[PDB]
Amino acid sequence: TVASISSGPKHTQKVPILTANETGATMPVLPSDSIETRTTYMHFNGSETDVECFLGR
Amino acid sequence: TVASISSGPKHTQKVPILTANETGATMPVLPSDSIETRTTYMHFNGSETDVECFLGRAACVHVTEIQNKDATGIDNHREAKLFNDWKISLSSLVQLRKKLELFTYVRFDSEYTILATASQPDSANYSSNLVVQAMYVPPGAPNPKEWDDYTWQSASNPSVFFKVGDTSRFSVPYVGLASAYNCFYDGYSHDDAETQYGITVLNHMGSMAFRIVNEHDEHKTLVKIRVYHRAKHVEAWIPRAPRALPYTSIGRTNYPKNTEPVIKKRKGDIKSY
Amino acid sequence: TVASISSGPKHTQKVPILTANETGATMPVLPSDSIETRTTYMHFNGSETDVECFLGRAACVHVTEIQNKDATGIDNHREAKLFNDWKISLSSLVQLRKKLELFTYVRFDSEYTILATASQPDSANYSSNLVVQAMYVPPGAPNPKEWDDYTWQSASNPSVFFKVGDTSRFSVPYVGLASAYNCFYDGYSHDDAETQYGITVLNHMGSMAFRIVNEHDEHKTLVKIRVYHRAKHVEAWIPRAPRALPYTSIGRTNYPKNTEPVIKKRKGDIKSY
Amino acid sequence: GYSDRVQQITLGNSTITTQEAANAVVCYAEWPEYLPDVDASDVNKTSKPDTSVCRFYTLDSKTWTTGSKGWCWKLPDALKDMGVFGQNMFFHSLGRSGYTVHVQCNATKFHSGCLLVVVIPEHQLASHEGGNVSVKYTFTHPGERGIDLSSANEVGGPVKDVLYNMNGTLLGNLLIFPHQFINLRTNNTATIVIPYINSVPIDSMTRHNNVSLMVIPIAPLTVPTGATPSLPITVTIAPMCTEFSGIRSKSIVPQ
Amino acid sequence: INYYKDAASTSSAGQSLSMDPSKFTEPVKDLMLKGAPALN
Amino acid sequence: INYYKDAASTSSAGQSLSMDPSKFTEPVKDLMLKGAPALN
Amino acid sequence: INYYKDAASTSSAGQSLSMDPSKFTEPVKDLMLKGAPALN
Amino acid sequence: GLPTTTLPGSGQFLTTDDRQSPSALPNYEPTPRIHIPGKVHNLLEIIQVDTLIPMNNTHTKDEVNSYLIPLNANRQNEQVFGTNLFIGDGVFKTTLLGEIVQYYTHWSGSLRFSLMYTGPALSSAKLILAYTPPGARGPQDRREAMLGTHVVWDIGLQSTIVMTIPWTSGVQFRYTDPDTYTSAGFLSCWYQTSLILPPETTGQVYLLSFISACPDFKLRLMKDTQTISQTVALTE
Amino acid sequence: GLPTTTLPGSGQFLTTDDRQSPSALPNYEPTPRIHIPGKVHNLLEIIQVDTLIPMNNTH
Amino acid sequence: GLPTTTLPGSGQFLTTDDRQSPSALPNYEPTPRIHIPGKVHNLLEIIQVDTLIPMNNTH
Ligand SMILES: Cc1cc(CCCCCOc2ccc(C3=NCCO3)cc2)on1
Ligand SMILES: Cc1cc(CCCCCOc2ccc(C3=NCCO3)cc2)on1
């Protein structure tokens, strides 16, 4: 799984970082929408935040 | 496997025993390069020198003590050993320490065994079985203040309850923040002029806290806790020179002043046997 | 299997019962060589005379004793039995000893059982469960000096913790330096004129050390340790004459002076029944 | 006619030639390489100035005399002020690097003396005070000057006792670390290639030094009769495969 | 048989049986052959 | 191996490995595409 | 079933069922047959 | 309910046993491993790297000088140094080899002892190193020494000489803590001809000496080292 | 009778262990589940919804 | 957790029982065996060698 993909300079008409929060959504913006990133992998599953785990001790 | 091959007289232009140590290598010279040998087999694998084996037996890492007594009128439970804690660390007791510091970075799961024995110093009667509670308190968790705080509810924090005289055992995965634990760290936590130097800054693993669950009887009971640690699934990188001088502190390399010569002086000459 | 075959009258030139013992042989003569027999079967295998069976049951090899008491002001823990040790050896108690010395060289794994029972000689109260620590101290290891030395950390040395009244059990591979243990050794450790003679020089197996982990209660408690040893995976070479006279020392063959006749004198003649 | 003996290292816009080498050591048998993605954590693209940072900087020279005890430099500290390497260093949040270290000391066939040149990963120093006294920052960040083991104890500084490696271990066992000797009779330089060694993929270049280079006289310098009793030792070091990441405002560090 | 779900809970690991001293005993850049001259 | 007959007696459940934040993060009636204008 | 890894930890060995007294009862160099004269 | 019987040893804690345990942190995910040069797998890997021996032990406080074996110009027939081979004690004891051997009870195998010469390049010398196998005394003169394992070393361009102490033994293991029965011999070194310095040169020259184990080597039965102890627990 | 040995840790209660237990109510039938909008499976699902920060903390 | 019942005899030590035990020295390698003439397997092997009888016991 990639945690971040590689992304480079941008000069577009397509701006993912401008939104309208009045709508009630949290738009899924990522580091790679606003800086230049390199690939990295997650190495993690989110196992210990499962509700079974959270309420299970 | 052969430990030595058979080899006979030599009169060559090819001399394996002359080398240049300035290069930094240790050339793999064998008995058969300089005497006449006979075949012999190894009969041995080097099993018990594997690092998993070397670091894999339980070592005592900590001895603490708590007492069961009437807390009535005690203004500071922590101070009365009504419960006590331990700022987890593996460098406080120094037998296991020298073994680990043969390496720079080490990675392993831990298996803890906790033995708790009771002592009744002041002539006594009937001892009612005490149950110890060991609970792990990680960094940024409500540290406990009395021996019976809400903290001990430990609703999200792993805790084990066992009886004095018995042993508790459980195993914790490698909890390091990086890829390995640093046995050494030549750095600071930030570039301040007075911040501590060493690892102590690095191995912020929080502390472990013990208490007796029982209320008090008429006499007082001393319970002494011994924590044993066994590394399992060991991985070690970069060997270093063994520790020669005595240790003075958890987490610093410092040795004591006016220490004694560590190399044994000859009783005789260089020429002596 | 037949134990005896059927055999009838004989009038031969072939006499199996006349031999020459000067040769060193024991000729395999049977009932059927000299009387008339009938067939009979063995019905038996000789199972319980196998050397694995003969040396394979636990035998008491050592009884020692340690006490739990206030060490305050004791200048010599070892001497107060605050802990004690044992210079491992298998020849100190002599029931198992005669059995082993039927052979010259013996090779086996050991299974140890350690029973520890407590005694309270001086009229007492409540006895808090004592936990014994047995730790193996091999040759060239920091011998322990107080009952709570760094030694007891035992970070590299196998140690077992069990409760008084219980038993501890574990098994140690054949730790001999050679291919077998010498039951006898007609040699010295070197050609000096005054060095000891025997095996004691050979079976340098180091010692075992016991202590109570508990601090002291108001009364004193005597704990007496019994070590049992069972050979498993036995291999024995070269049978010898059984021991006739009493033993005097661990590791020497010496018998006591003015000992008594070991062969029972007849009450009567050679002719007596 | 290639000898183990003559060598040329060209890195960036700078070249070194030695006509009296004794092979070269590559720590742990690994050559410096960039940070692979599979090992990456920070999502930032890194900056690889290449030839402007991966060239040879020659630190100021030392003087070996019969009384010398040895010198110690820390990396990347020693280079904190060299050209654009240094700027990059103070300006990014994180950086990573390997190095080629070339230590130089020539004499004549009448001199004797032998230096140990060793690289120690994570050399945590000891306070000469004992107990749990710390070693202040400035003291472990001597810069190009390095630490002079024959200088006096100072307060908040490290211990400078050579038979103990500045940490409670014996000089004799430093040989377990990648190292090379300079024996006037054999050798005139020592070269060690250092791959990046850390427990994290990239780190801060200012709060943590990841190797100390140590040059220690072991067989005392002995000059021919009526020779001047000393020789200079020069250390030239080149960052290799350097990467910087997390650019911003420019760190301010004590002293 | 593992009775437990997590990997940390399993017993000790089993012998590397890896063993390669050359990273420590011969970290030289140009390969040295035993028997050939050290410095050419 | 379950040793007991009833389901309540079995151990903890195993990870949902479900995970879908959109019911919480994007409950909008007309779909919003990142990059397209929020309000047209 | 061995529960333990090392061989020393296994139970007792099992009967040799070897049994050959001749090394002890007839170590003579030239073979003696029962019934034939001992000394010829 | 399945019928069971518990055996002797139940409830004991043996620091050396290896079993499974419940994890206190169910479901936790450890940090990924990244690559780090230098991984060690066996202590046998590292005792083959040679380290310096403080052979010149004759000082009174630890000094860099006890690593230096001095050589005198123009002496003939004489003896350069001597030592027994109790690798767990004496000169050997602080070396990495000595230091590891001390974690085990028994050792067997060949040792590699080398000497690197540091004198001016225009000097010359011929030394003899001799290994004396157990059973005889430390040699008292070269004649005595030369009848056992020996190497005539000719000081040249090639700066170091590697002597091997081949495993000579009845018993297949020796004790690391010095023991008689189990003793390994002596090592001595003498002038074969003599050190000669060039003109304009003077004084003593020194040899550095190293020790490492051959690939031959075996160590077994781990135990605690006499090389480290303590009187109270340390704190931060 | 099968021979056993008990290990260190026997009888301990670790609040984080996960094992089987006898049901006190053998054979009881729980109420059927009906559908309810909003099921949460991971805390990671919810920390992606944004909430307001009291940034102006100065009161 | 599997349900068990312990029988009479639990915890006893019978010097003649034969079971497995943990090795105190995990991974240790014993010295190789070499050949030695004279191996004994059964006491039945040796009681077939004849020995002298002090028949004249009258002393
Ligand atoms: C280096 C180095 C390595 C270590 C050991 C780290 C161990 C991780 C944290 O240790 C514990 C200890 C106890 C418990 C515990 N949970 C319930 C009872 O005890 C959990 C984690 O410390 N320093
Ligand atoms: C002949 C002959 C044979 C023997 C027996 C040798 C046994 C080897 C060493 O014995 C022990 C004893 C105890 C322990 C021990 N480890 C942890 C607790 O006890 C280990 C080895 O002694 N003499």
Quote the ligand 2 centre to C173 CA distance (angstroms). 8
Angstroms from I33 CA to nearest CA on chain J: 29
- Closest ligand to the CA of C184: 2
- Residue C36 CA to residue C23 CA, distance in Å, equals 28
Q: Write down the H helix ranges in chain C.
A: 51-55, 94-100
- Closest ligand to the CA of C204: 2
Cβ contacts of B4 within 8 Å, gap of 6 or more? B30, B31, B32, B37, B38, B39, B40, H166, H167, H216
- Closest ligand to the CA of C135: 2
| Cβ contacts of I20 on chain F, cutoff 8 Å | 2-4, 9-11
State this model's resolution in angstroms.
3.1
Contact H27 A48 (CB under 8 A): yes
With 0-12 CB in 10 A as exposed, 13-18 as middle and 19+ as buried, what is C146? middle
Quote the ligand 2 centre to C230 CA distance (angstroms). 11
| H-run or E-run covering H145 | helix H142-146
Angstroms from J18 CA to nearest CA on chain C: 8
Beta strands in chain D (DSSP E): 7-11, 14-18, 25-26, 57-58, 62-65, 71-75, 92-104, 112-121, 147-148, 179-183, 189-194, 211-222, 230-247
Angstroms from C26 CA to nearest CA on chain G: 5
At D171, give phi and psi (nearest 5°): -45, -50
Return the CATH class of domain C1-273.
mainly beta
Could you tell me if H167 lies within 8 Å of chain B, comparing CB atoms?
A: yes
Q: Write down the H helix ranges in C83-241.
A: 94-100
DSSP 8-class letter at B126? P
Touching partners of A (3+ C-beta pairs < 8 Å): B, D, F, H, I
- Closest ligand to the CA of H25: 1
Q: Write down the H helix ranges in chain F.
A: 22-25
């410092």: which residue's tokens?
B254
Could you tell me if B57 lies within 8 Å of chain J, comparing CB atoms?
A: yes
For C17, nearest residue in chain G (alpha carbons): G35
The answer to whether the beta carbons of residues C28 and C62 sit under 8 Å apart is no
Residue B120: closest CA among C225, C147, C70? C70
Q: What total number of domains does chain H contain?
A: 1
């312990």: which residue's tokens?
J6
Does E touch B (3+ CB pairs < 8 Å)?
yes
Q: What total number of domains does chain F contain?
A: 1
For I14, nearest residue in chain H (alpha carbons): H24
With 0-12 CB in 10 A as exposed, 13-18 as middle and 19+ as buried, what is H230? middle
The answer to whether the beta carbons of residues I39 and F15 sit under 8 Å apart is no
The answer to whether the beta carbons of residues C135 and C213 sit under 8 Å apart is no
- Residue B223 CA to residue B133 CA, distance in Å, equals 12
Nearest ligand 1 atom to alpha carbon B168? 18
Q: Is the CB of B225 under 6 A from ligand 1?
A: no
Question: Which residue's CA is the nearest one to ligand 2's atom 3?
Answer: C90
Q: How far is CA D247 from CA B180, C216, D80, in A?
A: 27, 63, 16
Does C touch B (3+ CB pairs < 8 Å)?
yes
The answer to whether the beta carbons of residues C234 and C109 sit under 8 Å apart is no
| Cβ contacts of J2 on chain H, cutoff 8 Å | 2
């943990």: which residue's tokens?
J22
At C107, list the tokens.
Answer: 């090779």
Contact C139 H229 (CB under 8 A): no
Q: How far is CA B261 from CA B14, B244, F12, H61, in A?
A: 43, 10, 60, 5
């990671």: which residue's tokens?
I44
Quote the ligand 1 centre to H30 CA distance (angstroms). 13
Question: Which residue's CA is the nearest one to ligand 2's atom 19?
Answer: C136
At C48, give phi and psi (nearest 5°): -90, 10
- Residue I18 CA to residue F12 CA, distance in Å, equals 6
Touching partners of D (3+ C-beta pairs < 8 Å): A, B, E, H
Question: Looking at chain F from residue 1 to 40, which residues have their Cβ under 8 Å from any Cβ of chain J?
Answer: 1, 3
Could you tell me if D19 lies within 8 Å of chain E, comparing CB atoms?
A: no
Touching partners of F (3+ C-beta pairs < 8 Å): A, I, J
- Residue D13 CA to residue D55 CA, distance in Å, equals 6
For A4, nearest residue in chain D (alpha carbons): D43
CATH number of the domain within which G29 lies: 4.10.80.10
Structural domain harbouring E25: 1-40
Could you tell me if C234 lies within 8 Å of chain J, comparing CB atoms?
A: no
Residue A35: closest CA among A56, A12, A57, A6? A6
**Which residues have any ligand 2 atom within 6 Å of their CB?**
C 88-90, 110, 112, 134, 136, 158-160, 172, 175, 181, 203, 205, 208; J 24
Of B136, B182, B232, which is best to mutate to test ligand 1, by the most ligand atoms within 8 angstroms of its C-beta?
B136
- Residue A13 CA to residue C210 CA, distance in Å, equals 81
Could you tell me if J12 lies within 8 Å of chain C, comparing CB atoms?
A: no
């040295």: which residue's tokens?
E32
At H18, list the tokens.
Answer: 């290896």
CB atoms within 10 A of CB D108: 14
CB atoms within 10 A of CB B187: 24
- Residue J25 CA to residue G5 CA, distance in Å, equals 11
At H96, give phi and psi (nearest 5°): -60, -40
- Residue H235 CA to residue H158 CA, distance in Å, equals 51
The answer to whether the beta carbons of residues D236 and D55 sit under 8 Å apart is no
Q: How far is CA C13 from CA C16, C28, C168, in A?
A: 10, 19, 67
- Residue D61 CA to residue D232 CA, distance in Å, equals 6
- Residue C80 CA to residue C70 CA, distance in Å, equals 10
Angle H18-H23-H29 from CA coordinates, rounded to 5°: 115
Angstroms from F28 CA to nearest CA on chain I: 13
For E27, nearest residue in chain D (alpha carbons): D29
Q: Is the CB of B158 under 6 A from ligand 1?
A: yes
């390969």: which residue's tokens?
E31
Nearest ligand 1 atom to alpha carbon B203? 23
């183990």: which residue's tokens?
D4
Interface residues from chain B to C (CB-CB < 8 Å):
57, 59-60, 93-96, 99, 115, 117-127, 164-165, 167, 221-222, 224, 226
Q: Is the CB of B154 under 6 A from ligand 1?
A: no
CATH number of the domain within which D238 lies: 2.60.120.20
At C99, give phi and psi (nearest 5°): -60, -50
